[PDB]
Amino acid sequence: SSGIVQQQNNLLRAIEAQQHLLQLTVWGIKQLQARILSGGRGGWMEWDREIEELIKKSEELIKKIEEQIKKQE
Amino acid sequence: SGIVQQQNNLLRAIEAQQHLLQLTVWGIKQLQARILSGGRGGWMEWDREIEELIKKSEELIKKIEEQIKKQE
Amino acid sequence: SGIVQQQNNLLRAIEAQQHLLQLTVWGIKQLQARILSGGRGGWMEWDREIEELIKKSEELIKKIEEQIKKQE
């Protein structure tokens, strides 16, 4: 059960697990930031922006890989 | 070069990023402890969601590592 | 798509997550600097470990992209 195909499927599951972890850490940072520094001064506004754009980019790629794997005919 | 060696390197990247993640979690927990005493405000659930995904992620990485070895 | 095209997409996913990790480390550092004065309490080693792991994984990521292109 250790072929390349299988390993690629497992790497994907690891990638998605870590993706979920990243969103959890982002949630935590926002909670702390909101309590310390209400308002986005010092670059937190561009930070929010970059995060949201990279989260979308990442979940899109994951979706696409999940589609490639299923696409097997 | 080749699919096998590229996969091993992908695993190394993911493993390095796993260690980075666990460091960032440590950082957040330290800060949260200082600003707010306790696990009120959602932090209890957060701690538990985090540790669940961490072990799951760790298991998959060890699993792939094993598959790579069994193939040799 | 095949294994080759999948690896390429996996790499892109990993590089996106590398940039995410860089952004979260930035946020944690901003917070720590505002709350705490020095590098006491483990933040000194945290900084060093973080920077090492960040360099190591982006080294691996850049290497893989190049290895793959060298396969043509």
Numbering used by the authors:
A (entry chain A): 0 to 72
B (entry chain B), C (entry chain C): 1 to 72
Authors' own words:
After the binding of the gp120 to the cellular receptors, gp41 undergoes conformation changes after fusion peptide (FP) inserts into the target cell membrane, exposing N-terminal heptad repeat (NHR) trimer, and forming the six-helix bundle (6-HB) structure. Peptides derived from the HIV-1 gp41 CHR are potent HIV fusion inhibitors, which specifically interact with the viral gp41 NHR to form heterogeneous 6-HB to prevent fusogenic gp41 core formation. Our previous studies have shown that AP1 and AP2, artificial peptides with non-native protein sequences, could form coiled-coil structure to interact with gp41 NHR and inhibit HIV-1 Env-mediated cell-cell fusion. To elucidate the molecular determinants of these artificial peptides, we successfully solved all three complex structures of AP1/AP2/AP3 peptides binding with gp41 NHR.
For AP1 and AP2, an optimized linker “SGGRGG” was used to assemble the NHR and the artificial peptide into a single recombinant protein (N36-L6-AP1 or N36-L6-AP2). Interestingly, the crystals of three different inhibitors belong to three distinctive space groups: P21 for N36-L6-AP1, R32 for N36-L6-AP2, and P63 for N45/AP3. Also, the conserved hydrophobic residues, such as W43, W46 and I50, in the artificial peptides were deeply buried into the hydrophobic grooves formed between each pair of NHR helices, similar to the corresponding residues of W628, W631 and I635 in the native gp41 CHR. However, in the corresponding sequence (from W43 to K76) of AP1 and AP2, a hydrogen bond was established between S57 (corresponding to I642 in CHR) and Q18 (corresponding to Q565 in NHR) in N36-L6-AP1, N36-L6-AP2 and N45/AP3. Thus, S57 in AP1/AP2/AP3 plays a role in stabilizing the interactions between the artificial peptide inhibitor and its NHR target, resulting in their stronger binding affinity. However, in N36-L6-AP1, N36-L6-AP2 and N45/AP3, I54 (corresponding to T639 in CHR) can strongly bind to L20 and L21 through fully hydrophobic side chain interactions. In N36-L6-AP1, R48 interacts with E45 and E52 to form a salt bridge network. Compared with AP1, triple-site mutations were introduced in AP2 and AP3, i.e. M44E, R48K and E49K.
